[PDB]
Design a protein around this ligand. Structure first.
Ligand SMILES: [Ca+2]
Ligand SMILES: [Ca+2]
Ligand SMILES: [Ca+2]
Ligand SMILES: [Ca+2]
Ligand SMILES: [Ca+2]
Ligand SMILES: [Ca+2]
Ligand SMILES: [Ca+2]
Ligand SMILES: [Ca+2]
Ligand SMILES: [Ca+2]
Ligand SMILES: [Ca+2]
Ligand SMILES: [Ca+2]
Ligand SMILES: [Ca+2]
Ligand SMILES: [Ca+2]
Ligand code: NA
Ligand code: NA
Lengths: 261, 261, 265, 265, 266
């Protein structure tokens, strides 16, 4: 969302600044519950595990188009990123189960995953499943023809994050054996009672240069941003639980680089 | 366009202030607390009272008139949350932890935030529930939609008024604030312990990557804060936010600039 | 004070070593280091805590080797505090789970001390400057304590009337006062508050750790009238008796402070 | 091995990439990456865990481009300089719909949580291990390699229990640790976090590198042109809807950068 | 000391390696590394813990190459400890949840070791200097222990009468004594106490970590009488038996210390 691209060229020197956000793809079970999943089911036998599409958070991604240009290529040098709306979880009056008789609502808590990537091509993913026998729904892209080895490392499960709201977060991780032309960062914190801990500051910049001083190079003059920001579980007054996600901001600086094809 | 730092005898000034917390102040005696929290309101019928909603605090601090032109440049800040030991009173009002025990400490979700800028803090609105009906005397996202639960770029505001912008509705906007520095941490959960450090030896440098601090437009500095420490649980089981004031000491220097006009 | 140069070498350096005992309330002669059992659920309009229930800040004034014996030589010296090594004394005493504490379950050991804690020290050349802040401005504080006077609802946030020196040991309740960040130009203070029923005490000891007390201009606290001021509060958590009653437990703090002679105008 | 100069030539650098699958017990063909359900409350005199209940260390020998023989010219060995490593599949624990006990009526499944151990090593020879037992009287199964001649002293430090991690899916994690008295030619890193309610906390990034050079600037030297990687990544316990519990493990990726080093022998 | 290796190379350097066993109480011959089960709720006026219930500090004197035939010199050569590498041994043993421990719930695995823990080591040129502090000054400590003498209520805070040397292994209860920050001029010590009934043990191992033992003047512990002292306490937490009874569990600690010869003022 909100993609803005600015190229400034003075002679030899060309800079592009990209600003955008990615909305989260938590499942959106109805139009009013944008940012949430469908309520979670539980205790499905591994042999009869058929999760509904709207229950499954997916990775977010966007292809950002750059000024269409040894080759000259756009090189991503820095990123500033932030999770947007962390204070929204201070609403304990709407929908959440009371913590006790006469108390306020229960904060969002529980397992969470915060992840982003910036690359010159789609993020390369490796599939790993909790249960290889899970039957995934139409509209998801999940590991093809999985086996019990898919519960550990099965090198058959290679994919590109090339479609928004399609690759379930539970099925896929960034592939550390690939991604030579992207930088990715994620933290998984698991557990029923895990507190969300989120920091915001406009003073943080991540440098995307590798050990040789080279950033992601934008093949075919396109930049890819990717995210997943599952903040935890929202517990309804009935006890049902729904994932809650938040959008992620990106500001990326790129420069024009002459490079070996 | 920034030129050189002025290096006279009177080229430095120090500003000190504190910001009181704006938790809701539900009666004349409960300054620093919110109204007791409601719970389990349907998203379609969520009408929080004003005194239940903590707000961001801010102050415009007028600076010596200087005047192509000189502007005050904020270089460092020392800041501290004031009165953290008041939470060691476990005899007053709080529910016993168990039969024969002391009162329950303040605990639960918290948010600690401050900013220093040369202009008002720029905010982005994000809601837990876009259908919340916010009370008279609050400034909340205007004409929100389900997209306001994720990122809706319509929701831009300046923190220009005290006791107005609820913390649950607004975050510092990472797409703006070019002339401010902000820092916040949200920690969510029923059982989160407050962890607060005080020392007069800690300094935050406000200079950006180019060595430039916030520049005080119109010879005014803006400080902003929110310090929701957690929930106070009354002996009845009702819960109220507790906030604390924030101290600021800002060092500024005179900076020559080309009038940007 | 206009600060000039550090004085040279040999006897230009002194070390002060001391400890501060904790002031937790000491409800009987056998329970030194503990508070009285905590009360709970007092209405804000009828909150009258007993003295022995209220931990207080510890403080001492340490007299330093006399400088400026030669009053009219026109070269004025003050001791400058440069470094401190400090730690909490007796942290392993909390491994006694056989005495007094409630069993964790049938046949189990005693419950460890845990819960809200506050660890704080300061080193200054004058008394520590405090700001009063109350949970409940209507609290009626007992004889023997020094607490914010004539408080109002504003005293629950920031009321600038409540300024005091930490000028008496075992008198200023920790729950009423904090170091004032708007003052203390001639002291350094450090504190961490961790609140909650189930917080674990986490305490580190090492004789290899040093805190430098010099400010941004390289100047440490300057000891007015050849006096060094140490202050502490080390509330370790709550001790839960077999009945379920709870008492604060505190421990002493050690200080080793290195000072040098500083010329001043 | 006496090290001489780093070689700087054209083919002086190589990269090895691999992953190690976890060895959690694999109690049936469908439950790769899990252990058998845990037994509990076995007397120390009658503790005989089944093989499928015991997570084991993973290890592999990685062959390197052949160098070299003192009679066949100059001596060269690969030196491991850096490693990039991470745990693969951490997001799979976001499946709370399959198998796991509901957290409460109408709730989602219980996340994997509880005791965990994350460990890796890179060496020029097999990892050297020291045996330590919870209970020296534990009878370990066919197919495992456990401390030989265990005694009560094996519950603390029995220097008899020395082994090389030279076999995958054989050395139970609960019986063995890396030996800090050996491993002169390897680097190892591990963290154990124990408890019923411990949250898994796992970071991934392709920007993180661990330098394997020692204080003299020397990395693991790959004897016989082989590198050894070792891992254990027990992520926590999976709680079935019945209340039974199973360990869950995940694979570990390694990318190791090596350079050619001249050596005397 | 379970095992000791002392190597003095051609280059006037000594490397000392040892493993120091924990002293948790050892209530029977099969429960090495554990304490006796804990008692609870003893009145402060009737608190008489049994010896086997009380973990004690571990210590050993390590003999070094005897340097000075001519002890009657104004300058002496002494061993100077420069670095230490240390590790807690056997942390993965706590992954045994099948033996002895109470089930977490019906059909579950055993309860992990958890609760209060203390991890401590020291390297010195002489015995570790200790300060006594008691939870309860009226505790009656058993035969075979060395505990603060003639304690008073001040012994529950700081009573400077309680000075001791850690001069006996398996004798000084951890609950009674701490390293004395007012002494130990010729030793370095490091400890972390984490208290609480549900605390998770968190233990890291790596052979890449080294602690430098030099003071601010670049001088390490100087080994008086050609002896080095290592000291430890590694209480990992409580083991909960299926009955509900609890026992401390401890682990051994490895030391690798590098020393050099220093000419010093007699
Ligand atoms: Ca599909
Ligand atoms: Ca690769
Ligand atoms: Ca591209
Ligand atoms: Ca601060
Ligand atoms: Ca302004
Ligand atoms: Ca009396
Ligand atoms: Ca008495
Ligand atoms: Ca030959
Ligand atoms: Ca060795
Ligand atoms: Ca050895
Ligand atoms: Ca080899
Ligand atoms: Ca001393
Ligand atoms: Ca000695
Ligand atoms: Na008192
Ligand atoms: Na196996």
């Amino acid at each position: 969302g909100g993609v803005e691209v600015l190229e400034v060229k003075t002679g030899v020197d060309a800079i592009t600044e990209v600003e955008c956000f990615l909305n989260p793809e938590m499942g959106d079970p109805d139009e009013n519950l944008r940012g949430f999943s469908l309520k979670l089911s539980a205790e499905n036998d591994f042999s009869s595990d058929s999760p509904e599409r709207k229950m499954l958070p997916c990775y977010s991604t966007a292809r950002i188009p750059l000024p269409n240009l040894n080759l000259l290529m756009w090189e991503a040098v820095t990123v500033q990123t932030e999770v947007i709306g962390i204070t929204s979880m201070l609403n304990l009056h709407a929908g959440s189960q009371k913590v006790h008789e006469h108390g306020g609502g229960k904060p969002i808590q529980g397992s969470n995953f915060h992840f982003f990537a910036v690359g010159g091509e789609p993020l390369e993913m490796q599939g790993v499943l909790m249960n290889y026998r899970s039957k995934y729904p139409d509209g998801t892209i999940t590991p093809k023809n999985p086996t019990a080895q898919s519960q550990v490392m099965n090198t058959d499960h290679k994919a590109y994050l090339d479609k928004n709201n399609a690759y379930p977060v539970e099925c896929w991780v960034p592939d550390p054996s690939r991604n030579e032309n992207a930088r990715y960062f994620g933290t998984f914190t698991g557990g029923e009672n895990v507190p969300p801990v989120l920091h915001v500051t406009n003073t943080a910049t991540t440098v995307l240069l590798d050990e040789q001083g080279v950033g992601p190079l934008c093949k075919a003059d396109s930049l890819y941003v990717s995210a997943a920001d599952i903040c935890g579980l929202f517990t309804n007054s009935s006890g049902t639980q729904q994932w809650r996600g938040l959008a992620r901001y990106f500001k990326i600086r790129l420069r024009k680089r002459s490079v070996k094809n």
